[PDB]
Structures are given as structure tokens and as C-alpha cells.
Symmetry: D2
Subunit: 350 residues, 4 copies
């Protein structure tokens, strides 16, 4: 940068290039930033748009000519043309047509399916068939064989969230093909063993790295958030903040996050609730499941409508405001920040 | 023992007594036994008897003259006149009369209440009122204020299980008095936050030493064991052994045992099921909740009838045989053996 | 207690005896004490005495007539004639004569050896020979084969601390006989792999329930306490309290206590140091390794001299005062209180 | 990819671009690879070269014109012009001149200093001054204030290893400036409290996310590897493989890795030792501290000489061969792979 630009210097630099050495002193860029400054940028996708483009994708791309991958990837404008919503996460709308199937495969990358629209599709996870409907969270944890069948003439839309960008950058990717029955049970084996509150099968005493619950069904989510707002009505502690009910989807063998790499939550805000501004390390994505409100990011307010999705990159100040009762599904890379002692939180309140 | 019995020896022994020294060589007894040989002995209490003596206790002992402690302690014949069912555990039948109450207190010793007969009594745990009915497990973990009220003209019987003998021998006992409302909610606050499968309130992210679930209600227990036998019907893994469904009551923040000192389980055996003989370190107590069968202990078969209770001391070989569908509530000191690396298991199968 | 003493009552009580039921209401004793009130009592043993009785035991009890168990057990006056220093722990002076040996055995009960006087005895733990000298702590953890040989014509005295009383009361005891070489290496294999600060063999990546270090040698203990007093001289944080250096013997795979059931520590107090009074749950034993001071227990001061030993039962208020530089080896049942969430501390300071 | 290229398609694609959607079906690249296929490539840097360019950097770049950052970054040829040795790690040669200093700063990114050449430089970590010499490992864990002073007229070379590339990609970076004494103690406070084998200060009972040992000095490393080869001579288990001694630098409060994000090890291979080929997930860097041998990567053998450094990206098959006694310092991103359940190992042996 500032050494004397002499012949002997330029010879040194020439030698550098040759030996693949880069010297610190010529480096100008933001080495060790004061706080995180992501290349990802806050962004909002409108459901009215995504749904439109999804339905058209249904007409224009059949099985045999791309229909197998009929998946609308959400790309952050800041991430150089990659189909990545944040630096750690991949989120896409999977638009599954009438009677459509996918064979089984397995990969190291962890993944979930959040059903936004439809019913009567089964994702068959290690042979265990897990039914899908609006508001269910399905897990297909890393190295679990998974495939699916649509048992109906209606299509389905779901959010596919994966840890692809993390796994790509970090070199951890593995993949295998599997290989019929097409069973359609109302509840999977996993749910039948693990979905009884406070009870654990004697046959499942070993803890697991990922939840053995195949589906976190809408019924239960909805009940939990209602009780929290009800307890608040009654003077009882329940909500994380006034008007703000919320649960964390957990692995019951452990009480921890669903998968090693991804946290999932569900938030219910009472009409007129306005959350305190947060800065949190790493990235998160919300989908507005029901109701109307707005989000503030970097001081910019965006009005939000049913089905809209948005991303908050690392350290971006954010808050939500409910106009009506505001329901949002949430996911993030937080289990990574926390496993590695990188997590840090600033709340405007405290 | 074998030193030469001389004047100088007897002088040494005299000096020993004076200095409170006991020399190893004169010690004869079973110092370090080959395997555990408990002073507690296997034993069975008949419900037809206990109920009889309980009902009479109701007539003969009113409030003001012992009725406050109307509690039939189960004493092991081997434990020198102590009201202790095993060396680690206290189990008693509490016979609560019409409209009877108890003020709040708190103690370090951990405790549970398993309802055998009745309904409509509330145990109010740290202010949170927890309703009681047949087949519910209630926890009153150590240092939680607890008291109760019977909201009815009918009596109630429950098993009171505590870690009293452990806590007495080990010197850990603490106790405080509390000090009205008498609320009668259908479900407690604890249940309302924690009894939704796979979901955890954002307001309860901290793990706990004991379960925050106040009641493990019968409904859920019954469903879990039915699904396990059903999965077995269907070729699916579920049961711990052929015909033998079983759950472990767990603390959901952790996936571990209900309380640091006590494990609780519930077993359902299909008619004609006969379990493999087990030797397990430490003690356990079963109550036959429903059905008919037998237990073998030390090779002795005892026929078992609805409501009967029995104890298996450390290392006693035991097995159960179901005549009808055989339901049993179970508890033990195993979390102690396991925390300290003393647990050891022998199964006749393997 | 207070029910009307009628014929029908006495019939009930008669039935109780017969069915081995004890009713709560007739129970008078201290059920659930306000704080711990141990049957064990504070006590001090004088070394000048123990040594005297130990040396005489050497003359009067040879191999063939008790010499194999030439062990002076320290019995608490409060514990009904048992050779138990507290309700959880066994502590004894082992007086090993010239050239004396013991074959290998193994037991579930955990144990340590603290060398007070002598050198050149090896305790051979799972085949690994561990040399012994004044101030060394040796572990023989549960289920490790152990035996010893005295390679010299001098005798040796050590403290044998075990978890016998706990294991007896709780029914966890197991025992086996083993079955030559008599090797005398300066340091054992364990020490050679594990006694290099901050370094862990790639061949020992698995954690262990008990420390793999066979001996915690005096050299190292002495250095650690000296540095702590030196840092204090220098204005640096180090001591737990002014004038009070102390280390905890730890299992290096874990950073935790030496064995699941026993904590060992070493304390060095600067002349004139006077510790704040503590109440701590469970029991502890100190031995005065070097120097002079006193101990206060229940408000009673006992002057203390080199080699003296004392016991503080659960919840007894205690403090030490150094006259000279005061060195003390310490052990306790605390890892038990802590594993089970029974531990509680009161310090006069705070 | 394969949908019919019609006007209506191109309109859909146009809409995609506008809404920042990327559709899966047009994606061609290696989405979910069969096994890891890093952009980083195996590479070797020669010390004779690095030292040459380092010494010249000393002449050509003084304080005031880059000398403050006189640091030769090792850039992987595969990583697009970034000064990153692997996708997760930053490794550089810091060439510190006569009497040169650096003020204190702190950052979230974790870091170590491995001294290759020189003595008598102190890195002052949170005020605690830690001396540096050949073969010492120094830690400056995340959020610890650190700076340094050279107390001599000789220069020093060290390896600076950081988790910069991980922290950059993942958005976790934080940074602060500090702000004299220039003390030169032989050992730091950290070492004085924590470098006594098997002993833990009572003032440090709390576990830590990173090791409190400031320096892992050469003496101790060297002793551990010598004992391991000696035990092998003697028929005792010690080495991880025949001829192959190795330790892992550990955090003593925990027994775990030095820092949350970086593993450090030291390997000593007996002459003629040839390791089994390994595939391991994530990246590692070795420096040849002493001796001569070779490394095989992807089947290509590179002869290796004292001070040479090399990188093995994720899943690259590798092995080392010792010609003489071969000593190597090693580091990796493995604690990340392991915290997140991404680690996987293939050894040619098994
Ligand atoms: Fe997939
Ligand atoms: Fe009570
Ligand atoms: Fe022994
Ligand atoms: Fe730095």
C-alpha cells in the first residue's frame, strides 16, 4: 500500500503472485468489520406474485421437461446471482402438481417443508409416510431418505428450507439415490411414538441429533399460541413480550432445535402489537402465515400481506407490527451461531 | 480377629474404643458384598386390604386428631421398623376425605402423586392449581410450594412417592411453611404452556432440573401405550419387547427424568406376555393400575390383582406375566444409580 | 397420635402391624427437618494418637493374623458403632508393614489413597504400577483392579477414603477377586500420557467417568498453591479468599471431579488467615498435612496439629484459622449432592 | 432447461429476474455433490521461499509504510484471489521486526500464534503478558484484547491462524480498538494457574468457551510425544497408530478443543512411519516443524522439508511419510464440522 514503489518492491510482488502469497499491507477491503455487514440485503417477496409465477410454472413446465424440479428459488439481490436467500440458507417455493411424485434420495444437508397451500401429499421419510397439510412443518433431517407422492388431483405449495449455502461454502455436501408402496396413513410412526406430551417411548431412550417427529401439525401450533395469549388475558406469564405469543419447534429427545443447523419458530402477535427492535447475529426468514401487518428493516417499513416472505441478514435491525392478529412462521441459522459462540443480541428495550 | 489375645492386645482395643477407632481385622460382616444384598426384601401389598384400612382410617381419624396426616405408609419388613418401602424411597397411600385441605409447605425432598381413585382435588404447586383424577401423575418437585384442596364430598386415594429415605440417610433435608383463593381450573398454567407435542414456549428457553409439567394426564398415557401395541400389530418397531408397550415420564426441557432422584414409567403388557427376568441396580415399586397377572421375585410367583403394589429391592431378579391386558405404574431410584455410574443390568435374554 | 383410643382403633393398629403399614399420624420423629441434622457429629482425631496405635498395630498384628487388614477405621461417635466417618464416606489409616503385599481385587465402590508417611510402595491399578510417596493422591476408581507391593523394609501410612457407607446404604456394592510381576517404574503409564498440562493424547479422545491419572504427585500440588499465594503478593486474582490458596483435584478428560462420588481438594492458608464460616450440604474430612492452626465447628474451637484429621457433617458451620502456613488435604461427598441438585451453601461473608 | 422455449416462457423468465426468483430447473451446476468437492485445492508452500520473501519484506516495508501489517497471507490458488488458505481458515506468516509493537484490539474471530523462529516477544492477552518462543502455541481467543511487543533487536516469525474466512462468509465479525506497561514475565498468570497437571484452581470452577491457557509451551509438547514413542517401545498402548505419536491441544476446563472454531494438534512420526490414507470432512493445515518426509494428496507425492506448510481441503485423501523423525504442527476447522454433525472419516485401514 504505502511501501516505496521501487524496482525491488515490484520484484517482491512478482515473487508473491508466483508463490501464491498475498501480503496484508496491500489489502484495502473490510478485513474485520466493526459489526457484521452482510453481502445479503433485506428483501421481501410478495405471495400474490410468487403464487402467480408458481401457477404459470405449473402450465409451462411439465414432468419430463423440468417439472421434477418445479421449484422457485428465492435469491438475495446481494448474493451475486446465487439462488440463496441468505449466506447460510436456501428457501424456495416447491409447486407440486396433480399426482406428482419424486423418488427417494438422501443428502447431508438438513431440510424442512412448511406447507402453505394444499393437502393430501405424503413425504415418505426413511420409509415412514408423513401426511402434509396447510400449516404443518415437516422435517427431512440430514441423511434421511426422503421422497414424496401427491395422492390428489390438486397441486400443493410448500416452503423448502435448506442449509445448502452453508453446506456449499463449508464443503460438507454428500448425496445418495435410493431404490414403490404409496401408503397414505393419517399420521406417521414418528408422530405416533413421539407426539404425546411429556411421554417418551422406552424403545427411544437414546437422544438424537435431529428430532424424530416427522410433522409438527398445525392443530398443536395453533393451540399453543392461543393458550399463551389467553394466559396473558388472565395475568399469567406466557408471552415473550406484551401481545407476542411464540413457540420454538424442538427435538423432544433433547429439548433443543429441530436440526443442528436450522431453528424453526412460530409467532402470533395480537393486533397492534409492535415488537422492540432487535439486532441478532446471523440470518432469519419469516413468512406471514395469516393476517396483516408490517416489518421495519434498517428503518424502512414494508407493509406485509398473507403469504409474504422476508429476510433479515446478520445484524440488520428489525421489528414487526401487527395490524390484525399477525401469524408468522420463522427460520434461521441461529443453532450455528450458538453452537460456535458467535451469537449476540441487542434489544431496543434493554 | 486372629491376633494373639494377649494383655497388650486388649490394651490396644481399649485404646481403640477410647479414640473411636474401629480396626478392619476384627470386622466380620459383609463389607463389600459380591453383588447387592439389600436389607429391604421383596414384598406385595394387596389393594383390597389397603383400601379397607384406608376407608376405616377415614372413620377413625378426623381432622384435629391425625386426619391431616391420614397417610398409610408402606414399610419394608426388612428395614428395622422404618416407614420406608425401599432404602431410597417412601411410598404411602394418602386418603383424603370430603372437602379436606392442606396448607402450603416446601421441602428439598422430591415427590410425586399418582391418583388411583377419585376426581376433583387440586394440588396447588407454586400458586399454579393442578386438577387430579384417576391415572394422573402429579409432580411436586423439590423446593416447590405445594398444598391442596378437595372440591368435593367424595374422598380420594393417591400414591405419595418421595425420596425421604435417601434424603434422611444422606442429610439433605430442608423444609419451610408457606402463607387462600381455592381456584378450580381444568388445566394448570404448566400444562397449558408445556403439553403441546414438540413445541416449547419462547418464554421457557432455560432448561430446568425438574419437569415444568404439573400433571401427566391419563388420556395421554393411554394413547401412547395403545399406539405402541397398534404399531406392533402393524409390523412397526415400538414396543421394548414383544407384547410390552412402555413409556417413561420425562421433563420436556431436557428429555430426561421427571425429577433428579426419581424415575416414573408406565407399562402396558398384552395378555400372555411374560417378561424376561431382570436384575437391575437399586429399587423399584410397581402398582397394578388395571388387569390381572403375576410377578416373580427370587423365583417366587405372586398373583397380582387391580391396585396391588410391590417392591423389587436392588439386584432382585424379577419379571411380570400378564393374564389379561396388564397396566402398571412404575417408579424407582434409577436416576440416582445412573447419575453416579452405579447402574448395572442383567437380562435373561442377553 | 391423637385419634380416640377405642377398641376399633386398636384393631386398626393391629391390622397395620400385620399388613406392614405404618400410619403417618402416629409418627413423632423429625420427618422432614428444617435443615440437615446429621446423626454424624463433628469430631477430631489426633495424629500423635493414631500413629501410636498404628505402630503398635504393626507389632501386634502380623500377616496371617489380621495384618492383611491392618487398617484403623475412623468411626463417627454418632453412627451407632459403624466404622463410618460420615454417613457417606469411609476413612481409615492403612498401616503397611515391611515388604507387605495385597493381591488384586475390584469393587464398584470408588476409592483414593492419600500418602501421609513413607515412600517406595506401588499400587498396581489395572496392571499399571503407580509409585507412592508423602503427599501423593492415588485413585483406584470403581471397577479398577488394584493391589499393591511394598518394595522396602520401611512401613507406610496412608488415608484410605472410600464411598463404602453410601454404597452400603444404597445397595450398589459389587466385588471380584483378580489373578505376580512386581515392577517398580518411577511414573505410571497414566501419568506419562496424562500429566502434561493442556495436552491430550489422540489415543484418549473418549471422556471417562473417572480420572485416568493414577497419581496426583506432591510436586505439582505444591507448585500450584505457591503460585496462587505469589499471584496474590503481585495484585493478581488467584486465591479464593484473601490468604487462601486452593486447588481441586480434577479428571482431565472432563474438567470434573476425580470420581463420581468423591471430591478431593488441597488447601494452603497463609499464616493468620481466618476463613469465613460455611454451612455446606453433605460431609467433608480434612487432614492437616503441614503447619498449625485450628478449626471451629458449631462454635467450638479445636487446636489442630500436623496430621490431625476432622469431620464436618452436613450443614455444620465450620471455619479454619492458620497459625503458621496451614496445608490441608480435603475430601467430601459433594459430587453426589451436586449431581442430584441437593447442594446448598451459606457463607458468613455473603 | 428443457421447458418449451416459447414466448410465454421467456415472459415467465423475465418476470423471474424482476422478482429475484431463480427456478431450480434451469440450474445446471453441482447443487448437492456426491461428496465434498472444494474450490480450495491441495497446496504446499516452501519455507525456504516464505522465509526469503519474509526477510525481504523486512527490508522493504518499514513501520509507517505497511510494516504494521507485515504479514504474508497464504492464498489457496482455488479461492478466487482471496487471502484464504481454505474456505474456513486464514493462515499467514507474521514477520515481526526488531523492537516492534502493536496496540491492543479485540475481534469476535478466534486466533492462535504458532512460533516458528525467534524468542522474547510478548503477546499481552487481556493484560496478561505471554512470552513467545520456537514451538509455543499461543491462543488469542475471540473477544480477548490482544497486542504485542518485541523486547529484542532480533525479528520473529509466527504462523497466524484465524477463522476469518468462516467469519466473513457467515457474517459474525465484530471488532474494537483498546487503549503501555511492557512487562516481560517468564510465564503468564494463565499458565501459573492452569499449567499444573490434573489440578484446577478453586477460583476457576466455571467452564470457559475457550482455553484459559495462554501458551502451550514447547517443553511440554515435546515430553508428551517422547513418552508416547517410549511407551510403544515398551509394549504399552499410547500411539494412535504404529510409529505415530500425537496430542491434541485442549481447553483444560472442559477437555475439549482450544477454541470453538479451531482444532490444534501436534504429530510426531518415527522414521519410516507411513500413515494410512484418510478422507476427513473440512480442511486442515500442517507445518513441518522438524525433520523430513513427504505428503500424498490426491495420489500426488510432495517431498517435504523443515518449515514447509500444506493444506488438505475437505475430503481430499491424504497421508504422511516420515523419512527422519517427522514433527508437524496441525490445525483445522474440525470443531465446526463436529459441533454441527457434519464430520465423517474414511481410513484406508478400516
Ligand atoms: Fe432432498
Ligand atoms: Fe409435601
Ligand atoms: Fe480395594
Ligand atoms: Fe488480532
Amino acid at each position: 500500500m504505502q511501501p516505496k514503489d521501487t524496482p525491488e518492491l515490484r520484484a517482491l510482488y512478482k515473487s508473491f503472485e508466483e508463490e501464491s502469497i498475498i501480503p496484508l499491507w496491500t489489502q484495502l477491503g473490510d478485513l474485520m468489520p466493526i459489526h457484521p455487514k452482510s453481502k445479503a440485503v433485506p428483501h421481501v417477496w410478495k405471495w400474490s406474485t410468487l403464487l402467480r409465477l408458481a401457477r404459470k410454472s405449473g402450465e409451462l413446465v411439465p414432468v419430463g421437461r423440468g417439472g421434477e424440479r418445479r421449484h422457485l428459488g428465492l435469491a438475495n439481490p446481494g448474493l451475486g446471482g446465487n439462488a440463496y436467500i441468505s449466506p447460510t440458507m436456501w428457501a424456495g417455493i416447491q409447486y407440486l402438481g396433480p399426482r406428482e411424485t419424486a423418488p427417494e434420495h438422501r443428502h447431508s444437508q438438513n431440510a424442512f417443508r412448511f406447507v402453505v397451500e394444499g393437502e393430501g401429499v405424503w413425504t415418505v421419510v426413511n420409509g415412514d409416510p408423513v401426511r402434509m397439510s396447510r400449516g404443518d412443518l415437516l422435517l427431512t433431517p440430514g441423511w434421511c431418505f426422503h421422497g414424496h407422492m401427491n395422492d390428489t388431483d390438486q397441486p400443493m405449495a410448500w416452503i423448502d428450507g435448506l442449509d445448502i449455502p452453508f453446506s456449499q461454502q463449508m464443503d460438507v455436501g454428500f448425496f445418495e439415490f435410493g431404490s414403490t408402496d404409496y401408503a397414505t396413513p393419517n399420521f406417521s410412526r414418528g408422530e405416533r411414538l413421539w407426539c404425546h406430551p411429556g411421554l417418551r417411548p422406552l424403545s427411544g431412550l437414546q437422544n438424537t441429533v435431529a428430532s424424530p417427529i416427522g410433522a409438527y401439525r398445525w392443530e398443536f401450533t395453533d393451540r399453543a399460541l392461543t393458550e399463551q395469549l389467553l394466559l396473558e388475558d388472565e395475568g399469567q406469564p406466557a408471552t415473550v413480550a406484551p401481545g407476542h405469543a411464540a413457540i420454538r419447534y424442538v427435538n423432544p429427545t433433547t429439548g433443543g432445535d429441530v436440526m443442528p443447523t436450522l431453528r424453526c419458530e412460530f409467532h402470533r402477535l395480537r393486533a397492534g402489537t409492535e415488537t422492540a427492535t432487535r439486532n441478532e447475529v446471523g440470518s432469519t426468514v419469516f413468512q406471514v402465515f395469516e393476517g396483516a401487518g408490517a416489518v421495519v428493516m434498517n428503518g424502512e417499513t414494508t407493509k406485509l400481506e398473507k403469504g409474504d416472505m422476508f429476510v433479515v441478514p446478520s445484524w440488520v435491525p428489525w421489528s414487526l407490527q401487527a395490524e390484525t392478529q399477525f401469524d408468522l412462521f420463522r427460520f434461521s441459522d441461529a443453532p450455528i451461531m450458538e453452537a460456535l459462540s458467535f451469537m449476540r443480541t441487542k434489544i431496543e428495550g434493554q
